[PDB]
Amino acid sequence: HMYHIDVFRIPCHSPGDTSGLEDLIETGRVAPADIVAVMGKTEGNGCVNDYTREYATAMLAACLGRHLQLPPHEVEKRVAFVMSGGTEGVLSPHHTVFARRPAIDAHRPAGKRLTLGIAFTRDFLPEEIGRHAQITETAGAVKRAMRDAGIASIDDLHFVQVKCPLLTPAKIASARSRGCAPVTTDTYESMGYSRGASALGIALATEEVPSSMLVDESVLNDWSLSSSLASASAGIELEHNVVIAIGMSEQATSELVIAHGVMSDAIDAASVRRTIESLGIRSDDEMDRIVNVFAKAEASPDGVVRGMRHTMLSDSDINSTRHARAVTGAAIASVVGHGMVYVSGGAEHQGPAGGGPFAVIARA
Amino acid sequence: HMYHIDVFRIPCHSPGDTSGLEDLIETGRVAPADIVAVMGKTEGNGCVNDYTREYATAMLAACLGRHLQLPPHEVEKRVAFVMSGGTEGVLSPHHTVFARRPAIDAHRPAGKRLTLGIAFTRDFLPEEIGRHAQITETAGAVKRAMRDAGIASIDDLHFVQVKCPLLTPAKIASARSRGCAPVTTDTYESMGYSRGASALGIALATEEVPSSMLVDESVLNDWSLSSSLASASAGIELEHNVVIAIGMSEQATSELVIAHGVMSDAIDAASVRRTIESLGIRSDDEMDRIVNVFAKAEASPDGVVRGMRHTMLSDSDINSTRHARAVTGAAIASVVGHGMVYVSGGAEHQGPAGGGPFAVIARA
Amino acid sequence: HMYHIDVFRIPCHSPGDTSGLEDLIETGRVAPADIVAVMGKTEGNGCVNDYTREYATAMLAACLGRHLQLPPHEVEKRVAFVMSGGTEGVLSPHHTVFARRPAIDAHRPAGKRLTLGIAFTRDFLPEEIGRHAQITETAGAVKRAMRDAGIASIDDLHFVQVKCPLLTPAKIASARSRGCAPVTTDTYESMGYSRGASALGIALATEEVPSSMLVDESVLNDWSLSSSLASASAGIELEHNVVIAIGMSEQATSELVIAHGVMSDAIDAASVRRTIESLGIRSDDEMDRIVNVFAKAEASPDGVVRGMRHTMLSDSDINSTRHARAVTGAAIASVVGHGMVYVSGGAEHQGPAGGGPFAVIARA
Amino acid sequence: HMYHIDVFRIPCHSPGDTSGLEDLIETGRVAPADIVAVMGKTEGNGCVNDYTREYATAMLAACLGRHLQLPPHEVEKRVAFVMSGGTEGVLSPHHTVFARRPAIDAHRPAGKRLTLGIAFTRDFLPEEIGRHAQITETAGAVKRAMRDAGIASIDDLHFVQVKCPLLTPAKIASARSRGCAPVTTDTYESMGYSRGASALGIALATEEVPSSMLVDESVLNDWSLSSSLASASAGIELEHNVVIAIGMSEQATSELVIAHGVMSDAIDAASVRRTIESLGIRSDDEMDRIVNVFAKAEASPDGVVRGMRHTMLSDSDINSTRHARAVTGAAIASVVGHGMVYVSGGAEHQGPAGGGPFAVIARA
Ligand SMILES: Oc1nc(O)nc(O)n1
Ligand SMILES: Oc1nc(O)nc(O)n1
Ligand SMILES: Oc1nc(O)nc(O)n1
Ligand SMILES: Oc1nc(O)nc(O)n1
Ligand SMILES: [Mg+2]
Ligand SMILES: [Mg+2]
Ligand SMILES: [Mg+2]
Ligand SMILES: [Mg+2]
């Protein structure tokens, strides 16, 4: 488990745009076989009927398939594609590409460095979404993802991304015909449950939350249960969970590091600023050391932000997750200097209620 | 209980437009003291953050207040204002004004005629919405509304309109602080529960559903439980239920009648045409005999309409109730020849699943 | 120019779903090399940021590419993909696949039969959209599409579909930097101009409108100028026009025919019913003779439908084209019995103002 | 012209909520006769079909009418109500109430203090919106508003709020029937033209732009023409312009001051922090000295923010002004510590292209 990790933030002109990826390959800066994960932001609505996520995944897989002479569906088992829809406000569509190579024969740098590991769960039944099966399978996958990363302990774990399913009317009907009530019948709300259960799965595996408290009924209810590392993103494009564990390792030789923090609420730019500082980034022009930022945002479920009412949860035209991404994307852009950052919405059991975990990847 | 009922469909140029009502008053066609109910369609979104409903109610109440030298809030206890938001597609904003006078004699026509009665429940606690208290109180109010109407039996009952509350984040928090979980935490979904429990209240009172089956857990679950007379409309503008029972009575001398039916699904224009025909209306210009049509529409919860998939429940930009109103408004407009008709969306336990009750008011 | 045309309506479970097409190929009912056009309805929003159109095109092209051992981009020059986004209300996502084979060595049936021809224009400059260049190039393409179809005269022409571009901020900036003002700076509105100019291109080529009247300034202004055959659909997925001319020919041996009509407004189900009748389709159960219906819908630009105000053009949450498709999709579904029909919105210079052309393809 | 100005930021629970205003009156902190202006933020969509603006105005006017024993419509001639819809992200609905009393002496502080003056133009014809008449009339009103304020010169002018009309389909048709093309036929876009022409009116009156350049064709075209003081807000609720000039005067004895700046773009929190610092406010709890912040936000019309593409102008679900408000509301909230601030969207000829003027009112 001794790798070298490269990370590349590449712009997208549209969800299907693979041209930035083709550039890296054709300029020799990354080898197709080494790519193990892509975390993207696509300009669909980030909710149920957002197919930019699947479209982006399909084009990326096709692009890599050509080079590796593989069928796209094979590439999707080889590579963890995690596409988060919704690029509201200043959020600029893009992919973060993660490549993994066997460690440059160390000659080991003086500290721990960026490592990454991936894992998948089985497909879930509709009636399992938001519930115990999803929690337990996710926990399992988080641990396998850690092992794959060569992450010695929780202390060295800085970010757990999970892609998870959602419910459609067909899946709901399919569950019903087996005499099983799905966790909800509202497709929008199903995303929260899927994200929530998955996040609790991470909290389970990281021992941030004791197993005893993780009953189905605690999901979306018990705000106190949370992982300060979990980033969950739901999608119509898959029936299983995809897990990416990102952390630091003695065995990694990457010229990159990662640190994590928590935003106390959607506008907590200070915490981001602080975590960035903890990686020795001073001026505005030292920001070019940051490869990307990854953050969770949500509408504060009490209906208030710093004592003032918000309308993000009462807005029947624009779902709360869209407002949340717009808000947090702006707060972060004001710090790093632009909106080409990964901000994912709906942060149930991820960081504090109304806030969310984030991580930063930077040059060593 | 011997009334004469007048019914006036009046156009609106905007939610606050009272100019059509001021016209009827100033042309002597209706007396302000006789107005007992207004059922409106306002051009807000018909969901949670739709304040066109409250705005329309406030201006109508102010208009009537001037003429009756009353405070608006007094008028709202005197008159049942039921404002249904959402006028999508060809739906044309308007009010239906119901006026009630002691029976005109003069002459009393042969056979039963249009009568109307109103009732109110108490304010509900947030945690009571969608649950037993709401069911039980509504049933009670339906009976009082029937008495007030002079409706001898269920057979003579043709339409029960109910206006009901919904949940906001504050109400949810209020409930939580009393250690009571609200029926849902999603404000959009709360409308369905409120409409559903209220509709089951109507079914209880009309003996369409036996009391034994009406447990909290059946609400939104058991599609088989329904009233073929119930029209439920949720709103942020009130904390209680408002009930309008419309039917036929020997004691009424109205030059108007009412018939009812069920649409099997959102495009079941045939059933509407059939019910219209059961009132002897057979050619396009004979449609002028119809004062208004009142109908419930919903997205079929199985995700299919006549075997083909629909996207109304997977659309995170446009809520299902908006699609449903647009669809059913069109289907009805194609029959009567325009969209100035009352179509309300979200028809849980109202008519068949995917369909909804409707009624027609016509010249005798 | 002696072909046999097959037409297949196939369901889609999602924009990228090619499984119905793979079924036809693997059951031998269509040969990949014979497919000359696909007209689709995808469940994106049908406006600017709708990538379901491009996603569907990309998967279809990939699917056909495998079979023909071609690159997808080659297939897109071989086959006219026209994807219309927006499946609101009961509209059910699907593709209509058109295949063309050399005429079964006639043995010529007794009448004219369904023929189809395709053509493309060059890419347009941003500043050319909605303007004269787009008009004139389209006209040219319509004629080449007619010739390719073997359509002897206008009388035998029943449907001209055109796919056209739209403006984005980048295209607008690119135009500006050349010192050329684009026809509009609003991306939504640019779709209307693109559809409009393209429709006038069809009217030019069909001699429905004399060339003298087709100045730039008449586009979107002069409601009297229109083609009763034009169906225009704008999209972000292309910079040129794609044209499909569908009609009747002596040389075609297709077991299919086509007839066309005009809806006078969005709810004019009667005209559809009538045109269907003109193809000897009687009962509800003879509807299975209809392969598909293709129709244009729009929000009446005077703000009124049959004398009553509509809100489709004042709604800042839901664009008019979405309302229009929902409305007309319902009106047609009430006739044919389901919503799996092609309804495209925004019908500027297509049929009457507030109405739109439609066509019907049926078994001979 | 010797006034004392009080300014009160008051929370709203809903658009019609007057309970905070009734509190100030009943606690003696403001006298109804002294109130000269209310600038509000209401939780409608801030675009065409937003009636929260008119609803809020109607309830405020009714509330004041009771106390002053006046009809609401009289109050609206006495008081400048400027309601800006759209409270996306962390934006918290509220009113800023401005009260004006004859100068309190007592004591008159050293140096210039907050003064305020109001003015109205005539109603515009539909065809005048976005054009020369609107520009010229606005300029006139700005000067009268300055006089009314006792603002000696441009140097002492810090904020010009203008409320302006927009186009509906009826107004468009009305214009058409007079043979006059309206500036646009798209209701959404009409807001930009109205805001733009009005803003150029302010620039004319303040001599920021020479009269020679202000031809109709420059409106929305020439990005170089702008006022660094103009804040324009369009609305369906009025046919004229309402102008509020806010500035500093020796004659004023207010315990309040005002400073202004420009955001270079939507995330330019630095400029806001800088302007706040120019009023000696340097730590987070010193923010309590700020009464409110007032700011213009817009989607950068080149489609980029700090070199990265944004999707705010390509998003057909959510209009650019909604994104813009969400973004700038967040950026400002991250500075002052909450979202109860006045942020209005669509900043054409207001500040730099992609940016907007703002002002700050603070305790002296
Ligand atoms: O697709 C997506 N994006 C985000 O930010 N969150 C979820 O749940 N899904
Ligand atoms: O305001 C309103 N309209 C409709 O159609 N349905 C509900 O639940 N509320
Ligand atoms: O993508 C699309 N669909 C429709 O119906 N109309 C347009 O212009 N574009
Ligand atoms: O109501 C309103 N709000 C805003 O922010 N901008 C306009 O033009 N109108
Ligand atoms: Mg959280
Ligand atoms: Mg029903
Ligand atoms: Mg037309
Ligand atoms: Mg500007």
Write out chain B in H/E/C secondary structure. CCEEEEEEEEECCCCCCCHHHHHHHHCCCCCHHHEEEEEEEECCCCCCCCCHHHHHHHHHHHHHHHHHCCCHHHHHHHCEEEEEECCCCCCCCEEEEEEEEECCCCCCCCCCEEEEEEEECCCCCHHHCCCHHHHHHHHHHHHHHHHHHCCCCHHHEEEEEEEECCCCHHHHHHHHHCCCCCCCCCHHHHHHHHHHHHHHHHHHHCCCCCHHHCCHHHCCCCCCCCECCEEEEECCCCCCCEEEEEEEECCCCCCEEEEEEEECCCCCHHHHHHHHHCCCCCCHHHHHHEEEEEEEECCCCCCEECCEECCCCCCCCCCHHHHHHHHHHHHHHHHHCCCCCEEEECCCCECCCCCEEEEEEEEC
- Helices B132-149 and B187-205 pack at an angle, to 10 degrees, of 50
What residue's CA is closest to ligand 3, atom 5? C344
Q: Find all residues with CB under 8 Å of B69, minimum gap 6, and list them.
A: none
**B233 C-beta closer than 6 A to ligand 2:** yes
Identify whether C67 is preceded by a cis peptide bond (ω within 30 of 0): no
Q: How far apart are CA B276 and CA A70, in angstroms?
A: 62
The shortest CB-CB distance from D51 to any of B15, B62, B170 is to B15
Annotated binding site of C: 53, 84-85, 195, 233-234, 298, 325, 344-345, 347, 350-352, 355
Q: Which fold has domain A108-254?
A: 60s Ribosomal Protein L30; Chain: A; (3.30.1330)
Q: How many CB atoms lie within 10 A of CB C270?
A: 14
Residue type, A25: I
Map residue C59 onto helix, strand or coil.
Answer: helix
Q: Do D328 and A328 form a contact (C-beta atoms < 8 A)?
A: no
Q: How far apart are CA A335 and CA A298, in angstroms?
A: 19
| Phi and psi, residue B153, nearest 5° | -155, 170
The sign of the CA dihedral B272, B278, B282, B288 is negative
- Which residue, chain included where needed, has tokens 């509408």? A299
Q: How far apart are CA B244 and CA B114, in angstroms?
A: 13
Domain spans of chain A, in order of start: 1-107, 108-254, 255-364
Please list every residue in chain A whose beta carbon sits closer than 8 Å to the beta carbon of residue B221.
181
**B326 C-beta closer than 6 A to ligand 2:** no
Q: Alpha helices of chain A — where are they, by DSSP H? A: 19-26, 52-68, 72-78, 132-149, 169-177, 187-205, 269-277, 320-336
Identify whether B106 is preceded by a cis peptide bond (ω within 30 of 0): yes
Q: How far is CA C319 from CA A135, A336, B324, C223, C302, in A?
A: 40, 35, 16, 20, 16
Map residue D293 onto helix, strand or coil.
Answer: strand
- Which residue, chain included where needed, has tokens 């992200």? D89
Q: Do B233 and B166 form a contact (C-beta atoms < 8 A)?
A: no
Query: Method used for this model?
Result: X-ray
Residues of B with CB under 8 A from a CB of D: 13-16, 43-44, 49, 51-52, 54-55, 58-59, 62, 170, 236, 317
Catalytic residue among D218, D227, D233, D254: D233
Q: How many CB atoms lie within 10 A of CB A283?
A: 6
Tell me whether residues A14 and C236 touch, CB distance under 8 A: yes
Pocket-testing residue among D129, D294, D344, ligand 4, by greatest number of atoms within 8 A of Cβ: D344
What residue's CA is closest to ligand 2, atom 5? B344
Terminal C-alpha separation, chain C: 20
- Which residue, chain included where needed, has tokens 């009771």? D66
Tell me whether residues A51 and C62 touch, CB distance under 8 A: no
Q: How far apart are CA A243 and CA A240, in angstroms?
A: 10
Indicate the DSSP class of residue A288.
Answer: G
The shortest CB-CB distance from B90 to any of C267, C269, C340 is to C267
DSSP-assigned beta bridge partners for residue A57: none
| Closest listed ligand to the CA of C344 | 3
Tell me whether residues A16 and C55 touch, CB distance under 8 A: yes
Which helix (H) or strand (E) element contains residue A40? strand A35-42
Q: How far apart are CA D49 and CA B147, in angstroms?
A: 41
Q: Find all residues with CB under 8 Å of A266, minimum gap 6, and list them.
A: A297, A298, A299, A300, A305, A324, A327, A328, A331, A354, A355, D89, D90, D330
Catalytic residue among A194, A198, A226, A233: A233
Please tell me the distance in Å from D344's CA to the nearest CA on chain B. 19
**What's the length of chain A?**
364
**What's the length of chain C?**
364
**D53 C-beta closer than 6 A to ligand 4:** yes
Please list every residue in chain D whose beta carbon sits closer than 8 Å to the beta carbon of residue B236.
14
**D323 C-beta closer than 6 A to ligand 4:** no
Q: Find all residues with CB under 8 Å of D124, minimum gap 6, and list them.
A: D133, D134, D137, D165, D239, D240, D241
| Closest listed ligand to the CA of C356 | 7
Identify whether C107 is preceded by a cis peptide bond (ω within 30 of 0): yes
Map residue C264 onto helix, strand or coil.
Answer: coil
Residue C351 backbone zone (phi > 0: left; psi -120 to 50: alpha; other: beta): left
Record the tokens describing residue D345, joined without a space.
């969207």
Residues of A with CB under 8 A from a CB of C: 14-16, 43-44, 49, 51-52, 54-55, 58-59, 62, 236, 317
> What string of DSSP letters covers A95-126?
EEEEEEEEPPS----SS-EEEEEEEEEEEPPG
D351 is in an annotated binding site: yes
| Closest listed ligand to the CA of C194 | 3
**D199 C-beta closer than 6 A to ligand 4:** no
A53 is in an annotated binding site: yes
Q: Any residues with Cβ below 6 Å from ligand 3, and which?
A: C 46, 50, 53, 84-86, 191, 195, 233-235, 321, 325, 344-346
Q: Do B168 and B234 form a contact (C-beta atoms < 8 A)?
A: no
Identify whether D106 is preceded by a cis peptide bond (ω within 30 of 0): yes
Buried/exposed D153-163: b ≥16 CB within 10 Å, e otherwise:
eeebbbbbbbb
Q: For residue B166, which atom of ligand 2 is closest to its CA?
A: 8
| Phi and psi, residue D360, nearest 5° | -130, 130
Record the tokens describing residue D363, joined without a space.
């305790």
**B40 C-beta closer than 6 A to ligand 2:** no
| Closest listed ligand to the CA of D302 | 8
Which helix (H) or strand (E) element contains residue C328? helix C320-336
Map residue D153 onto helix, strand or coil.
Answer: coil
From C162, C139, C143, select the one nearest C152 (Cα to Cα): C143
Q: How many CB atoms lie within 10 A of CB A271?
A: 16
Q: Do C235 and C164 form a contact (C-beta atoms < 8 A)?
A: yes
Q: How many CB atoms lie within 10 A of CB C139?
A: 22
Q: How far apart are CA C326 and CA C309, in angstroms?
A: 17
Beta carbon pairs, C and D, within 8 Å? 81
Q: Do A52 and C16 form a contact (C-beta atoms < 8 A)?
A: no
- Pairing between strand D80-85 and D35-42? parallel
Indicate the DSSP class of residue A227.
Answer: B
What residue of D is the nearest CA neighbor of C182?
D221
Q: How big is the CA angle at C318 (ends D342 and D313), to the nearest 5 degrees? A: 60
Q: How far apart are CA B53 and CA B81, in angstroms?
A: 9
**D233 C-beta closer than 6 A to ligand 4:** yes
Chains that touch D (3 or more CB pairs under 8 A): A, B, C
From B344, B287, B351, select the one nearest B40 (Cα to Cα): B344
Q: How many CB atoms lie within 10 A of CB D140?
A: 18
Q: Do B234 and B164 form a contact (C-beta atoms < 8 A)?
A: yes
> From the CA of B321, how far away is ligand 6's center (Å)?
12
Q: What is the CATH number of domain A1-107?
A: 3.30.1330.170
Tell me whether residues C314 and D45 touch, CB distance under 8 A: no
In the residue annotation, D233 being an active-site residue is answered as yes
Record the tokens describing residue C241, joined without a space.
């026009």
Q: Do D86 and D47 form a contact (C-beta atoms < 8 A)?
A: yes
Q: Do A266 and A331 form a contact (C-beta atoms < 8 A)?
A: yes
> From the CA of C236, how far away is ligand 3's center (Å)?
10
* Annotated resolution, angstroms: 2.6
Q: How far is CA B250 from CA B254, C277, D341, in A?
A: 10, 46, 61
Residue type, B105: D
In the residue annotation, A41 being an active-site residue is answered as no
Q: Do A198 and A232 form a contact (C-beta atoms < 8 A)?
A: yes
Q: Find all residues with CB under 8 Å of C98, minimum gap 6, and list them.
A: C5, C6, C7, C35, C36, C37, C38, C39, C116, C244
Please list every residue in chain B whose beta carbon sits closer than 8 Å to the beta carbon of residue C333.
267, 305-306
Tell me whether residues C316 and D188 touch, CB distance under 8 A: yes
CB < 8 Å & 24+ apart, contacts of C281-290 = C281/C362, C284/C337, C287/C336, C287/C337, C289/C362, C289/C363, C290/C336, C290/C360, C290/C361, C290/C362
Map residue C9 onto helix, strand or coil.
Answer: strand
Q: Alpha helices of chain D — where are they, by DSSP H? A: 19-26, 52-68, 72-78, 132-149, 169-177, 187-205, 269-277, 320-336
C1-107 shares its CATH topology with C255-364: yes
> From the CA of B300, how far away is ligand 6's center (Å)?
8
Residues of D with CB under 8 A from a CB of A: 11, 13, 43, 45, 87-93, 266-270, 305-312, 314-315, 317-318, 322-324, 326-331, 333-334, 337-340
The CATH number, out of the four listed (3.40.50.10540, 3.30.1330.160, 3.40.50.720, 3.90.79.10), of the domain defined by the range A255-364: 3.30.1330.160
Please tell me the distance in Å from B345's CA to the nearest CA on chain A. 14
Q: Find all residues with CB under 8 Å of A248, minimum gap 6, and list them.
A: A112, A113, A114, A115, A151, A156, A158, A257, A258
A347 is in an annotated binding site: yes
Residue type, C361: I
| Phi and psi, residue B334, nearest 5° | -65, -25
Map residue D285 onto helix, strand or coil.
Answer: helix
> From the CA of C276, how far away is ligand 2's center (Å)?
36
Q: How far apart are CA A214 and CA A216, in angstroms?
A: 7
Chains that touch A (3 or more CB pairs under 8 A): B, C, D
Q: Find all residues with CB under 8 Å of B223, minimum gap 6, and list them.
A: B301, B353
Which helix (H) or strand (E) element contains residue C25? helix C19-26
The sign of the CA dihedral A320, B133, B354, B42 is negative
Q: How far apart are CA D67 and CA C315, in angstroms?
A: 36
The sign of the CA dihedral C320, C325, C326, C332 is positive
Q: What torsion, rounded to 10 degrees, do the Cα atoms C58, C59, C62, C68 define?
A: -110
Q: Do B137 and B197 form a contact (C-beta atoms < 8 A)?
A: no
Report residue A99 CA to chain centroid gap: 17
From C226, C62, C197, select the one nearest C129 (Cα to Cα): C197
Pocket-testing residue among C52, C82, C344, C349, ligand 3, by greatest number of atoms within 8 A of Cβ: C344
Q: Do C131 and C197 form a contact (C-beta atoms < 8 A)?
A: yes
Q: Do B357 and B296 form a contact (C-beta atoms < 8 A)?
A: yes
Q: How far apart are CA C90 and CA B263, in angstroms?
A: 15
Q: Do B352 and B301 form a contact (C-beta atoms < 8 A)?
A: no
Q: Find all residues with CB under 8 Å of D164, minimum gap 6, and list them.
A: D129, D134, D138, D194, D195, D197, D198, D232, D233, D234, D235, D238, D241
